[PDB]
Amino acid sequence: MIIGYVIGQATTQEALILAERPVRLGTYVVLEYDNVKALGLITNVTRGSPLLDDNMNDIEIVQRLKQFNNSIPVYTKAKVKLLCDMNNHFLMPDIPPFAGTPAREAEDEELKSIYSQDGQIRIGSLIGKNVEVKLNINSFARHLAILAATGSGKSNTVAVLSQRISELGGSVLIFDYHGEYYDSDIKNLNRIEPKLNPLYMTPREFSTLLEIRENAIIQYRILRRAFIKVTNGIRAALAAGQIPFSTLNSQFYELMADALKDEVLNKFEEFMDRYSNVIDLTSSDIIEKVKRGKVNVVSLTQLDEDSMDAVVSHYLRRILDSRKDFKRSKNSGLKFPIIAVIEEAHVFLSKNENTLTKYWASRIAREGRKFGVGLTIVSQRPKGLDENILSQMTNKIILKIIEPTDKKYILESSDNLSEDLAEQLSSLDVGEAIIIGKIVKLPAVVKIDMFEGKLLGSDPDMIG
Amino acid sequence: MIIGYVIGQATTQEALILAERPVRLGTYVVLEYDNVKALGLITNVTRGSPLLDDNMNDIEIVQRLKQFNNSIPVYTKAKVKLLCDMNNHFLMPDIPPFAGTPAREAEDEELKSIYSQDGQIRIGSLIGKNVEVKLNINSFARHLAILAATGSGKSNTVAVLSQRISELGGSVLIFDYHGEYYDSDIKNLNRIEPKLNPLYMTPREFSTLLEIRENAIIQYRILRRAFIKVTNGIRAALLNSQFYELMADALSAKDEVLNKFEEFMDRYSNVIDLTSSDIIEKVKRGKVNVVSLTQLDEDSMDAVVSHYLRRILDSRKDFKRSKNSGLKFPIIAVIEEAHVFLSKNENTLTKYWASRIAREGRKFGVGLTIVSQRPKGLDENILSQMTNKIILKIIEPTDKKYILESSDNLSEDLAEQLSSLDVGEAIIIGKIVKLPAVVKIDMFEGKLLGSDPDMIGE
Amino acid sequence: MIIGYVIGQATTQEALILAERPVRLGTYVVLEYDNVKALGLITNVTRGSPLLDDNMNDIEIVQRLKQFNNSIPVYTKAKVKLLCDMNNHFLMPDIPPFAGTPAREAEDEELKSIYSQDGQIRIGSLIGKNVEVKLNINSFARHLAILAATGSGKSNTVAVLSQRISELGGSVLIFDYHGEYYDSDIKNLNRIEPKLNPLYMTPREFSTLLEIRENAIIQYRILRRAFIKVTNGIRAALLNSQFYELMADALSAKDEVLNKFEEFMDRYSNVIDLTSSDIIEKVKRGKVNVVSLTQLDEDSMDAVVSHYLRRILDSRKDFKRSKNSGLKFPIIAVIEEAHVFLSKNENTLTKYWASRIAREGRKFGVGLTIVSQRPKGLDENILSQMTNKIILKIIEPTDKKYILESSDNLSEDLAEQLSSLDVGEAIIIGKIVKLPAVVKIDMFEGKLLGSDPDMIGE
Ligand SMILES: Nc1ncnc2c1ncn2[C@@H]1O[C@H](COP(=O)(O)OP(=O)(O)NP(=O)(O)O)[C@@H](O)[C@H]1O
Ligand SMILES: Nc1ncnc2c1ncn2[C@@H]1O[C@H](COP(=O)(O)OP(=O)(O)NP(=O)(O)O)[C@@H](O)[C@H]1O
């Protein structure tokens, strides 16, 4: 269906069309000229009048014109981002379109050829069209950033993605900040409680939690000797059957307090006061608690800022080290690839702050691909995310962003986002998104499916 | 009532109108074209003339025209922010309006459908229209920022909001900087004196007050042991002098702890009270609880506010976890003069616990409200977590810029119109509203105590 | 073949052409005027119409014109970067081209005279033309940076280059991040496992790994003495367990050294091997030597890469000085995923020794090649020493800006055209070429192992 023709100046990646039919953001269009089949995306759309223009100042003339019938000339103009040339193996158009080049609505066959065949995980469909958008699953190892303003559909995206992946036999680990997935009717759900077991920690890790640097050789020595001593003693006592699980946490407190000098002691006691609600030597390792083909969800719902940081960083570290061990030995460690999802990531990943999660998020961002560990970060404040972590997020599902410095922030943290695409992020609607990265073959404007279930609310009763 | 028609260029979220009737900021308008019923908000309004334009240089010609009768053509133009499409489930208009599209005043029933039904707490009405605006009370868990220039109506907004919330059985904790609410005829008032009880402090908190932390590892050990020992003993028996002498007994390192302890008892003497009950017990449900900070210094104030904030957060946390301990009802903490506590170039204790509530509070039924006149003197991390924002008159663009970059739901053209706001007028964004609202805030029917003292005396 | 004529304004390094034939980026053109034979490069190409311009608003008029036959006038314009004057010893054109100066396609013989004769290593051919581009191999001592967005052909460039160099008897050391080259059918392949041998470490290097430096002066003394003593003894006898127990014997300060030592043997257990020979002996001349980093962690990787880099540099240095010791042949070290090692907000060991090679390497026959997709995540001091640069598709202007400010031989208009590059296409600058080259890089005829793992499993 011919909806318009090319007018004015055009380059190899941008053109202007005059339309005969109404068009809008997210509309895909084909421009055929020479041996070039140029796929274009409608971005900006404006309407005007040669008669009733900006400098029209007489209201009475307009009122008279209304008394008549369709006696006013109007136009519709639309900017077109030229994506590729379908004739030349989907490369860039090597020649601009001629003025007068007809622009037609893209066909289902063409769109499905691009957005449905190279993908496995369905995220939704194109706007207006009946074309399913499928994401390439292996490309998730190149990590994902889900960004949007408040209430635009970040968590709905996570829910849909987690479900479809699990249905494809994939494994996901969601850190649930508000308890949205933990109390939902999502399929393949695997509930995990936040526990910190020192028996599955390293002395390095235990030192970091106690805010003890490893280069602090005096304190670290005292701590490492003591920690190894007490853990070994407890394990030997469990094998000998001389420590009941009814009394295992308390014993660990007193044993460590005995094996320890004042700085280590101060930080250790503060560690047990600050993380009391989390420490559990009875709890199994997170690796055993994580199930394949399941949407594994860790509840952070009744934890504080510090406790959250400690739990997530531990599980991240455990996952990464385990996946490494599996690549090396093939007879131990996490046997299947996993995708870790950090909700409310701007709480953990700020640049002006140094949390434990940010360190291990960065590690996974640089290593995770080699060990089958994909990372997904979800936030509403892009500029509150570390540049180094955001820039390593190759794949990006960006819903509505209206704050301009946020747009620029995503642009400078992306290597595959164009400024003219970023300029239309404010015109996005709830559930609509611009999807970039290797998860798609070309930049995709998508309507994301509504999660068939029902996620728990995050807003509590403020009256009672 | 047709007030104008669409002229010139139009997008899916902005249009230009030529008006036949006088219009102003905050006027809502309907644009019906095709199958689109577009709600739009009038922002900038300009007036001009094709005859007496900017380049008119002859004063004698103008004077001659004045002797006649209406021989001068004038126009009124207004930019319209296209909010939504009421026909298509209140989404964005998917197509721009045609030039010549008539613009009518929005109907009361329509505006009331958007700004009254999804809300519970009344803040006031729209500008020009007779439509009450009701705010979603549960959305306050996403925290609130009341921002304005000096004398624009920040405390009046706090007064009205605290009242309506209390009337619905809601609870508010106001930290009163100037003593404005404490001796007022506000309804459901619950007066609270600023008290610091060491029996409800943590070794961390008590050590910080004595300025003993990492700078003194030895002293911290001595202090923590002594403090835990003495406090346990006092609680077990179940008083100020007793606590002093007992602490002085339990203690060159011990003298260093003792020195700072004696000093601590001097600097915060006007606040320390072991007879006083925990803040959790003094707070009443369905009441406007106000702590008077009127006669405290920076340090005592910071210590009290941070303590009560920490206690509130920890109690509500314990309640979600155990349900057999802690604060049983949700509360909204309100910090007046927040730029004093939340500056970035300073590190106060209140700032730590405000940020804490800003990140955790939603989960435990603790809402945070910050009231201030210096926006750029508010920490980015705390201001950006204030999802809801009641923004009154701001004329400094760098202030606008700062608020804009700390919001994820504020538009540039809306922030551009903050300077045309008047006393009592505000732009309201967040989940407390269904759509961005330009509102006339009701005048508090009570009487807040004045903030400016007599600078002469008698 | 005349493809256009010069119109409008022209300088000594830029001109505007009206074209009769379709043209594109990377097309070379000759401008003959006066005594000047000017080589020019087509960068930006635009199309327009005097009739159907930007302000065309009537769709019915356009539709009518379509019913006719070629009743619409169109134009094609292209900006041309004036490179040199082939008549005047390939210097800059000293005079602008006249308007109406005909522009012809450059001849194969001419292009081959510039891009084939001063080079040895073939990278590919020019865009549209059938002219092979050969790179100067000796100029690689001025180091190389391969920069592009994700999936543009960085590793394909590395693969091709490593092959041709090896075929000419050149030596390459690739640090393989994803294990792409290690199990591939690339020619002259020499597989190397990641090993750390303390017998080839310095007391400085071994101390840094144990995290013992200025933070522990006492421990550093104890450690250095022990390490030197034990290593000397082991070398004199001429093994892992023996080194462990001997070091454990030679050693509260000694326990502090011992604690960090035991931990060191745990964290780098998968790498430590005293049986392994020095990297200098494992490297073969005329081979593509590849170290597999596929199953290492950040720390082990950083330790291995930095160690091999340091060993290479020091050996080549000793060889220039003594000629009776050290690496006897020049080598080119290639760092894949360089933004992981060379970030500015981080201080890795590889970063120190990359910078070292970047400043010294030219003198000792050690070339450095960095491959990455995040340019602004590369240290300015290291990137600016990369004289030669193969820049493929970059669409982010701040990335362009960053590459531009780290180059001394990249022009703004060339950097402005980086976004129009395609997969396999590149802008090549440096002494490896005689003139800035827009090139189609050959597809590696072999097969690199994939980098993306199965994210589902079986
Ligand atoms: N694809 C979608 N289609 C339709 N409605 C959607 C879609 N995604 C989200 N919504 C709705 O939009 C609202 C926002 O929900 P949610 O998915 O949690 O967004 P959010 O970004 O996580 N909100 P927040 O986390 O507080 O910033 C809910 O009412 C959803 O039902
Ligand atoms: N909605 C309103 N309508 C009419 N008058 C109002 C309104 N709100 C406040 N006022 C009056 O305007 C003046 C401003 O005082 P106030 O309400 O305290 O603003 P304020 O911003 O809190 N002053 P300050 O805190 O010192 O910057 C007072 O006389 C109020 O009674």
Ligand SMILES: Nc1ncnc2c1ncn2[C@@H]1O[C@H](COP(=O)(O)OP(=O)(O)NP(=O)(O)O)[C@@H](O)[C@H]1O
């Ligand atoms: N000169 C070329 N001509 C044609 N295809 C090419 C060329 N160079 C690379 N490709 C192909 O394009 C794709 C890009 O892969 P690759 O060459 O590894 O780029 P890359 O930048 O190294 N990917 P990455 O390192 O993850 O950012 C692969 O399918 C290559 O086979």
Ligand SMILES: [Mg+2]
């Ligand atoms: Mg969410």
Ligand SMILES: [Mg+2]
């Ligand atoms: Mg006030």
Ligand SMILES: [Mg+2]
């Ligand atoms: Mg590569």
